[PDB]
Paper text:
Replication initiator proteins (Reps) from the HUH-endonuclease superfamily process specific single-stranded DNA (ssDNA) sequences to initiate rolling circle/hairpin replication in viruses, such as crop ravaging geminiviruses and human disease causing parvoviruses. At the heart of DNA processing of all HUH-endonucleases is a structurally defined catalytic nickase domain that first recognizes a specific sequence/structure of DNA; nicks ssDNA at a ‘nic site’ to yield a sequestered 5′ end that remains covalently bound to the HUH endonuclease and a free 3′OH that can be used as a primer for DNA replication; and finally, facilitates a strand transfer reaction to resolve the covalent intermediate. To uncover the ssDNA recognition mechanism of Reps and identify potential motifs that might confer sequence specificity, we solved the first high resolution crystal structures of two Rep nickase domains from Porcine circovirus 2 (PCV2) and Wheat dwarf virus (WDV) with 12% sequence identity, bound to ssDNA encoding minimal sequences comprising the respective origin of replication (ori) sequences. With this, we term this turn-β-turn structural motif as the ‘single-stranded DNA Bridging Motif’ (sDBM), and suggest that it is the main binding moiety responsible for recognition and conformation priming of ssDNA by Rep HUH-endonucleases.
We present structures of two 10-mer bound structures of inactive PCV2Y96F (1.93 Å resolution) and WDVY106F (1.80 Å resolution), and one 8-mer bound WDVY106F (2.61 Å resolution) structure. The pre-cleavage state was captured by mutating the catalytic tyrosine to phenylalanine. All three structures are in complex with the divalent cofactor manganese. Additionally, the catalytic tyrosine (though a Phe mutant in the structures) is positioned for nucleophilic attack of the scissile phosphate, where the active oxygen of PCV2 and WDV is measured at 2.2 and 2.9 Å from the phosphate, respectively. Strikingly, despite the absence of bases that make up the hairpin stem in the short target DNA oligos, the ssDNA is bent into a ‘U-shaped’ architecture like one might expect in the context of the hairpin loop. The U-shaped DNA sits in a shallow channel on the surface of one face of the Rep protein with a distinct topological ‘nose’ that juts out in the center of the U. The bent conformation of the ssDNA in the Rep structures is driven by both intermolecular interactions with the topological ‘nose’ of the protein and by intramolecular Watson–Crick base pairing between T−4 and A+1 along with adjacent hydrogen bonding between N3 of T−1 and N3 of A−3. The consecutive stretch of 9–10 residues in the turn-β4-turn structural motif (‘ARCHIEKAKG’ for PCV2 and ‘HPNIQAAKD’ for WDV) has two critical functions in the structure. First, it acts as a ‘bridge’ between 5′ and 3′ ends of the nonanucleotide sequence contacting positions −6, −5, +1 and +2.
Author numbering: 12 to 112
The structure:
DNA sequence: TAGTATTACC
């Protein structure tokens, strides 16, 4: 049930929610990336994220760390694929660690 | 899994 690797989307993040995530300790993660997306024409600003935790984490622990309003899923793709997907719009909020095999 | 949404990796 608890799982090491999760993606997340957070739609219309507020400055508070961005700070919560910004302020996460980097010791929590083997790899973590968060991109700001959805800022272009007629479209929803959101965080596009991926977390590879040091330890496996339950669904509700992940929501505690990242925020109540996040949509989260067990990651099916590799760290590298997620790194590319969450970097695709060119405005990264944070990235720490390195992608893992 | 719940929450926010059409954004969400393979
Ligand atoms: Mn996106």
């Amino acid at each position: 049930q608890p799982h090491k690797r999760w993606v997340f989307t957070l739609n219309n993040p507020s400055e508070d929610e961005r700070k919560k995530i910004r302020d996460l300790p980097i010791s929590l993660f083997d790899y973590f990336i968060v991109g700001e997306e959805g800022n272009e024409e007629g479209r929803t600003p959101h965080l596009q994220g991926f977390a590879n935790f040091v330890k496996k984490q339950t669904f509700n622990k992940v929501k505690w760390y990242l925020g109540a309003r996040c949509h989260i899923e067990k990651a099916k793709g590799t760290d590298q694929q997620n790194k590319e997907f969450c970097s695709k719009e060119g405005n990264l909020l944070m990235e720490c660690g390195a992608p893992r095999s």
